[PDB]
Amino acid sequence: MLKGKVAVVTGSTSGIGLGIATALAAQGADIVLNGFGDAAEIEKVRAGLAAQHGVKVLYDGADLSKGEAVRGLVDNAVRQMGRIDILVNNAGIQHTALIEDFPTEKWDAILALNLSAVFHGTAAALPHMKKQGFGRIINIASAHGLVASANKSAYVAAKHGVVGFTKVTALETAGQGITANAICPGWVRQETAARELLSEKQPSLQFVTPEQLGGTAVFLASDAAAQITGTTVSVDGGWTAR
Amino acid sequence: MLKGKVAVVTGSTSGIGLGIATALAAQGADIVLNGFGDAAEIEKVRAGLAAQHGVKVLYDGADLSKGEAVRGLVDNAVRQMGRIDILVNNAGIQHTALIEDFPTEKWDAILALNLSAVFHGTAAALPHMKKQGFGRIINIASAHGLVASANKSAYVAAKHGVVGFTKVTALETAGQGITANAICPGWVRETAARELLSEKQPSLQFVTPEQLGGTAVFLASDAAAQITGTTVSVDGGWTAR
Amino acid sequence: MLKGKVAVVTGSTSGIGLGIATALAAQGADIVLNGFGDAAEIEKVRAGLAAQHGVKVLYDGADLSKGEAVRGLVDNAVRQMGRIDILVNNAGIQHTALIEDFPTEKWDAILALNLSAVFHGTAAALPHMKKQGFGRIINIASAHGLVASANKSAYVAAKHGVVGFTKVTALETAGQGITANAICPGWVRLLSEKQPSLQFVTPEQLGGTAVFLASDAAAQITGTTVSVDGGWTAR
Amino acid sequence: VVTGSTSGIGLGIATALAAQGADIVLNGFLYDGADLSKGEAVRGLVDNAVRQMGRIDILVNNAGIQHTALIEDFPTEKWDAILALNLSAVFHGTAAALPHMKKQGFGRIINIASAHGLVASANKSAYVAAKHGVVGFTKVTALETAGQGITANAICPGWVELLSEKQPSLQFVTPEQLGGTAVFLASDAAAQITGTTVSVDGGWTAR
Ligand SMILES: NC(=O)c1ccc[n+]([C@@H]2O[C@H](COP(=O)([O-])OP(=O)(O)OC[C@H]3O[C@@H](n4cnc5c(N)ncnc54)[C@H](O)[C@@H]3O)[C@@H](O)[C@H]2O)c1
Ligand SMILES: NC(=O)c1ccc[n+]([C@@H]2O[C@H](COP(=O)([O-])OP(=O)(O)OC[C@H]3O[C@@H](n4cnc5c(N)ncnc54)[C@H](O)[C@@H]3O)[C@@H](O)[C@H]2O)c1
Ligand SMILES: NC(=O)c1ccc[n+]([C@@H]2O[C@H](COP(=O)([O-])OP(=O)(O)OC[C@H]3O[C@@H](n4cnc5c(N)ncnc54)[C@H](O)[C@@H]3O)[C@@H](O)[C@H]2O)c1
Ligand SMILES: [Mg+2]
Ligand SMILES: [Mg+2]
């Protein structure tokens, strides 16, 4: 369990991030949600998680494309929740196109959110975690942080950058009660159609779910994973095995 | 929880294997212990786990150096336990020496146990798991299954082979409710301790059988249904640099 | 030999880049040098290679921290040299500090040059190489593009990013007579902490490696990394 | 010395090394025929090379067989064979070449693994496993010879459209390309290239 602990999950207003925030809340961790979408639906999710799990849940609408806003999210989490034990850097965006046709604006945006926000979040969290003698940085990368796919140059580059940054984070904090790891998901979600689309990269022909990724984050945040650091955990149904 | 499931752990009469068997027993899984040791000591361990965790625990001392003995362990597990949901290939041995001075005897011994045993054990279990529509093969490799160190060629070669074998197992079982992964541990066990770990383990802290047991429990969980054909490094940063 | 071929090497005014530009010139390739340092020395180098190897050697001092400038380097290279067969993205900088103490300005500068310049240069070169039906993109990453070291977050992240970008480049050009690879050097001048051989890597060796990747013997070597680190990544 | 150089890649590498002016010692089924499936023969072919050739500077372990079948149907017979040659031979060959090279103060061990020494494919458990084994063995060899003038590396080839599934380049790799690669690895430019792999797979492992 994670009672008494505080977890900040970027881009948790929906999808994978919400699945992770939910799983952590279910372990008794207080949560700080983040991301965009419909404000009423967001408040419903925030209020609902707090009630369903008996934990404190706040919403911070910080725009992660801005370095200072990312750092502010972490520092405010500490001010309001009293500490920060788990930081899940999850928010990300995508754009497909040949390298020569890839807009510089899109390249910069993907690098800023998918990679630099990991830097800014981590930088702000580390001083608190070191003083706490406890920390868990969980970066949601991708199978594309380990291998490549055509037409996703910026995304692949940024995700590879995250895996490398994660390793450095682990080395700088080794032995200080802090670990840093990167979860690398395969595809996340007519049955014939689905299996056909997954056939290309995902051998299991099964989609990875937000609940499964949430369970993986919960494991990394547990004491059993105290010595799991600077590594990647592939949840890709065999994507990278071949 | 793993109530109603049966887990076979090779080389579990002590150390890491026992740590894994214990964590699995704590989740409610019936256990099949394996390995060598003192009859009384082993029985104390076996009876103790069964009583403490309220599950059935069998002990099979099959010598895993022989391929038929390995498959026999699995068959005997299904025969006596009724099924096999989880197989943890853990048994292993080591021998240090330069390549030109590495006894061929030792080379063949390390490969037979550290690698071929995984093949034999896996072959025997798959038929049952495929029929059940569920299975978890957890191979305990090592950091040396990903990187290397001087004077341990057979060990490193075997461990690498295990990683490769794990991926194939995963590919052949994809989507059939069966996963296969390899846990790659770093140093497993104050100033001296740190000095000894300083060379390979950044954390300067040992990995524990309990932690590896918790890692096996995670891999056997439903949250890990889509984690297959990969490695989980529990090395305190060993492989990050 | 690379007679009739044009190679552009970023950051070739010294160290590794110069070692690679030189090695490629010795193979008959025309060269476009780039980078900073002393102007008089740069001219001596440029004229010296052209005369000593009998090839056209040009100098373009484009500041590669600027995307448009990188694209301009390649386009002007096609204008003045007539073609571009080899693109060696080598230019890079470094900064060391704990992540929490790492200046945002340094993180941005390292990503801009060490990673984004590889994108801009590749983006500009591809249209030409595809039309030509030939191309060789060689990115100089680092052992830090495969593993990490404490206090070098921006550098390690950027190098890893380069390794990944190289893989995508290879896949988008697969089979079009174009290959994209990354050379990952170890230390280049206690060396025992990272490099087992206890021997530094040299610009000459790296140059020789670039020549091979540029040769036809490596026509099917693409989307991979070639470690020249004396055992760094082995352990 | 180039094992399994009686044809295919082994011959391609053998050839390429010839065009460079290095005395060659062929093998398979000077010339030798030692059965590499026997650690006895393998170790012999090496020492027999330094005997009749005067010395050994480049050892290329290329011998290897294949067999496909689900793991549970994979004959223990085949498994042991694929392992015996595809992997154990590299240990025997290398074990017999090190004392010589170390004394010579120079050496180039070139193991011919496969893309299957880095990734895997269904129904090739024994081959994939021995290949990964080669990669690991190659790395240990380097660490034990680091700074002694000897390097150990592994070439991991792809297919040598029916390759659409594994090779995006959709083009086969050739024995000469592999030969040139071997030539390069033997080059003085590869003095610091040790303990690593070189993938020649048209982008196989990149995705
Ligand atoms: N979808 C997949 O199958 C898949 C594959 C593996 C890796 N990934 C990675 O998983 C993570 C989650 O992806 P997802 O599929 O749940 O996506 P999603 O779009 O469902 O969720 C992204 C979240 O990011 C937030 N966000 C975006 N830009 C932001 C900004 N500037 N500031 C603050 N918040 C911002 C959104 O509000 C949203 O809640 C991403 O990092 C992605 O790259 C996803
Ligand atoms: N301890 C470490 O630091 C470390 C590092 C990473 C990897 N490893 C791996 O961890 C695993 C467990 O090692 P450990 O350190 O717990 O050692 P251990 O000696 O404590 O346990 C090994 C077990 O294997 C059993 N065994 C040995 N030969 C056998 C045979 N022929 N048949 C059946 N059982 C046999 C023994 O009876 C024993 O219970 C091994 O696979 C090892 O390679 C250990
Ligand atoms: N030990 C090592 O030296 C080592 C380790 C492995 C990787 N690396 C990488 O090798 C590559 C070559 O660097 P080096 O070690 O020869 O160092 P160097 O400083 O001698 O060479 C770097 C070159 O980059 C050029 N440069 C810098 N900023 C530029 C800009 N804005 N625009 C255009 N050119 C610019 C310089 O003028 C110089 O010629 C770098 O990418 C570096 O990160 C070096
Ligand atoms: Mg792959
Ligand atoms: Mg290492």
Is residue C122 within 6 Å of ligand 3 at its C-beta?
no
Three-state SS across chain D?
Answer: CECCCCCHHHHHHHHHHHCCCCCCCECCCCECCCCCCCHHHHHHHHHHHHHHHCCCCEEEECCCCCCCCCHHHCCHHHHHHHHHHHHHHHHHHHHHHHHHHHHHCCEEEEEECCHHHCCCCCCCHHHHHHHHHHHHHHHHHHHHHCCCCEEEEEEEECCCCCCCCCCCCCCCCCHHHHHHHHHHHHCHHHCCCCCCEEEECCCCCCC
Residue type, D157: P
Asked whether the beta carbons of residue B122 and residue D71 sit closer than 8 angstroms, the reply is yes
Residue found by looking up tokens 């552009």 in the block: C8
Which of A153, A64, A107 has the alpha carbon at shortest distance from C112? A107
Which residue in this structure is represented by tokens 């330094």?
D50
Calculate how far, in angstroms, residue C194's C-alpha sits from the geometric centre of ligand 5: 8
Q: Let me know: does D3 contact D93? Beta carbons within 8 Å.
A: yes
- How many angstroms separate the CA atoms of C4 and C83, rounded? 9
User: Does ligand 2 come within 6 angstroms of the Cβ of B117?
Assistant: no
Residues 6+ apart with CB under 8 A from A8: A31, A32, A34, A73, A74, A77, A84, A86, A87, A88, A121, A125
- Specify whether the CB–CB gap between B135 and B173 falls below 8 A: yes
Q: What are the beta bridge partners of residue B207? A: B188
Q: Which residues of C131-164 are buried (b: 16+ CB within 10 A; e: fewer)?
A: eeebbbbbbbbbbbbbbbbbbbbbbbbbbbbbbb
In sequence order, the β-bridge partners of residue C135 are C178
DSSP 3-state of B200: coil
Quote the DSSP letter at residue C114. I
Residues in chain C: 235
Q: How many angstroms separate the CA atoms of D155 and B4, rounded?
A: 47
Q: Are the C-beta atoms of C84 and C8 separated by less than 8 Å? A: yes
Residues 6+ apart with CB under 8 A from A166: A118, A137, A139, A141, A180, A181, A182, A230, A231, A232
Euclidean distance between CA atoms C33 and C73, whole angstroms: 10
Q: Per DSSP, what are the bridge partners of residue A185? A: A235
Q: Sort strands A30-34 and A57-60 into parallel, antiparallel or unpaired.
A: parallel
CA separation for the pair A52, B237 (Å, rounded): 37
The amino acid present at B174, given as its one-letter code, is A
Q: Which two tokens stand for residue A26?
A: 């279910």
Taking residue B38's Cβ as centre, other Cβ atoms within 10 Å add up to 10
The domain locations on chain B are 1-241
d(CA A163, CA D62): 35
D1-207: in CATH 3.40.1110.10 = no
Which residue's alpha carbon is at the smallest distance from atom 18 of ligand 3?
Answer: C15
Q: What is the DSSP string of A137-170?
A: EEEE--GGGTS--TT-HHHHHHHHHHHHHHHHHH
How far apart CA C19 and CA B219 sit, in angstroms, is: 49
Beta bridge partners of C89: C139
- Going by C-alpha positions, the residue among B169, B3, B26, B156 that lies closest to residue B89 is B169
Query: Which chain B residue has its CA at the smallest distance from C147's CA?
Result: B241
The dihedrals phi and psi of C76, each to the nearest 5 degrees, come to -70, -30
CA of C15 to the centre of ligand 3 (A): 7
∠ CA B233-B236-B239 to the nearest 5 degrees?
55
Phi and psi, residue A34, nearest 5°: -160, 155
d(CA A77, CA C181): 43
CA distance B29 to A86: 31
Rounded Cα distance between B115 and B92, Å, is 9
Q: Can you say whether the dihedral through the CA atoms of C144, C147, C148, C154 is positive or negative?
A: positive
Q: What are phi and psi of A218, to 5 degrees?
A: -60, -45
Q: Going along chain C, which residue ranges are E strands?
A: 6-9, 30-33, 57-59, 86-89, 135-140, 178-185, 225-228
Q: Give the whole-angstrom CA distance, residue B149 versus residue D141.
A: 9
Residue B14 alpha carbon to ligand 2 centre in Å: 8
CATH code linked to domain A1-242: 3.40.50.720
How far is Cα D98 from Cα D86, in angstroms, rounded to an integer? 19
For residues A178 and B200, give the distance between their C-alpha atoms in angstroms, rounded to a whole number.
18
Q: Element (H or E) spanning B135, and its range?
A: strand B135-140
Query: Whats the size of chain A, residue-wise?
Result: 242
The contacts of residue A199 (CB under 8 Å, 6+ apart) are: A205
* Shortest alpha-carbon distance between residue A159 and chain C (Å): 7
Q: Enumerate the β-bridge partners of residue D200.
A: D157
CA distance A235 to A220: 13
In this structure, the dihedral spanned by the alpha carbons of residues A204, A205, A208 and A211, taken in order and rounded to 10 degrees, is -90
Token pair 């990969």 in the structure block, residue: B230
Q: What is the distance between the alpha carbons of residues B181 and B230, in angstroms, rounded to a whole number? A: 5
State the distance between the two ends of chain A, measured CA to CA, in whole angstroms: 35
CA atoms within 13 A on the CB side of C84: 30
Cα distances (Å, whole numbers) of residue C66 to B98, B180, C18: 52, 47, 22
Q: Which residue shows structure tokens 């070098």?
A: C152
Sign of CA dihedral C190, B153, D154, B142: negative
**Exposed/middle/buried for residue C66 (C-beta within 10 Å: 0-12, 13-18, 19+):** middle
Beta-carbon separation of B226 and A209 below 8 A = yes
B40's CB contacts (< 8 A; 6+ apart) are none
Task: State the catalytic residues of B.
Answer: 155
- Check residue A188 and report its DSSP letter: B
Report chain B's C-alpha Rg in angstroms: 17
Annotated catalytic residue within A155, A165, A187, A239: A155
Report d(CA C124, CA C76) in Å as an integer: 11
Q: Count of residues for chain B? A: 241
Alpha carbon distance, N-terminus to C-terminus of chain C = 36
Cβ neighbors of B82 (< 8 A, separation 6 or more) are: B6
Considering only the beta carbons, identify the residue of A147, A149, A241 that sits closest to D120. Answer: A241
Alpha-carbon span C124 to A152, nearest angstrom? 17
The reply, when asked if residue D140 is annotated as ligand binding, is no
Yes or no: say if D68 and D124 are a contact pair by the CB < 8 Å rule.
yes
Chain A residue closest in CA terms to C147: A164
**What fold does the segment set B1-241 form as a domain?**
Rossmann fold (3.40.50)
The two three-digit tokens of residue B67, written as one number: 């391929």
Token digits of residue A204: 């299991």
Q: How far separated are the first and last CA of chain B, in Å rounded?
A: 35
CB neighbour list of residue B80: distance below 8 Å, 6 or more residues apart? B32, B58
How far apart are alpha carbons D10 and D39 in whole angstroms? 19
Alpha helical stretches, state H, B34-116: 39-53, 67-81, 104-111
Q: Are B240 and A171 in contact (CB under 8 A)?
A: yes
Are B29 and B1 in contact, with CB atoms under 8 Å apart? no
Give the pair of three-digit tokens for residue A50: 């707090």
* C115 DSSP 8-state letter: I
CATH superfamily of C1-235: NAD(P)-binding Rossmann-like Domain (3.40.50.720)
The DSSP secondary-structure symbol of A205 reads -
A59 as an active site residue: the answer is no
Which chain D residues contact residue B147 at CB under 8 A? 139
Given a contact cutoff of 8 angstroms between Cβ atoms, the answer to whether D60 and D3 are in contact is: yes
Under DSSP, the state recorded for B56 is -
3-state secondary structure D129-166: HHHHHHHHHHHHHHHHHCCCCEEEEEEEECCCCCCCCC
Min distance C39 CA to chain A CA atoms (Å): 31
Max Cα–Cα distance, chain A, nearest Å: 52
Residue D85: name the closest of D71, D69, D57, D66 by CA.
Answer: D66
Q: Tell me, using a 6 A CB cutoff, whether residue B22 lines ligand 2.
A: no
Taking Cα atoms as reference points, which of C131, C215, C216 lies closest to residue C173?
Answer: C131
Contact C60, C76 (CB under 8 A): yes
Strand partners, C9: C88
**CA distance linking residue C29 with residue C47, whole number of Å:** 15
| C79: CB partners within 8 A, 6+ apart | none
Return the structure tokens found at A110: 């993907």
Resolution in A: 2.0
Q: Which residues pair with C201 in a beta bridge?
A: C188
Number of neighbours of residue C1 by Cβ within 10 angstroms: 10
Q: Is B57 left (phi over 0), alpha (psi -120 to 50) or beta?
A: beta
Name D60's bridge partners: D2, D110
Index of the ligand 2 atom closest to the CA of residue B93: 43
3-state secondary structure of B191: helix
3-class SS of residue A95: coil
Ligand nearest to the CA of C109: 3
Look-up of token digits 């009739």? C4
Q: What's the CA gap between A177 and A167, in Å, rounded?
A: 15
The DSSP secondary-structure symbol of C56 reads: -
D110, D101, D24: which is closest to D57 by C-alpha? D101
Task: Tally the residues of chain D.
Answer: 207
- Note whether A201 and A152 are within 8 A (CB): no
Q: What are the backbone dihedrals phi and psi of residue C192, each rounded to the nearest 5 degrees, phi first?
A: -70, -25
Residues of chain B contacting residue A229, judged by C-beta atoms under 8 Å apart: 202-203, 236-237, 240
Which structure tokens are listed for C134?
Answer: 């030939």
| All residues at 6 or more sequence positions from D103 whose CB lies less than 8 Å from its CB, including other chains | none
Contacts of D53 (CB under 8 A, 6+ apart): D23, D25, D30
Contact yes or no for D117/D161 (Cβ under 8 A): no
Interface A:C, Cβ pairs < 8 A: 133
**Atom number of ligand 2 nearest to Cα B209:** 16
Using the 8-state DSSP alphabet, how is residue B143 labeled?
Answer: G
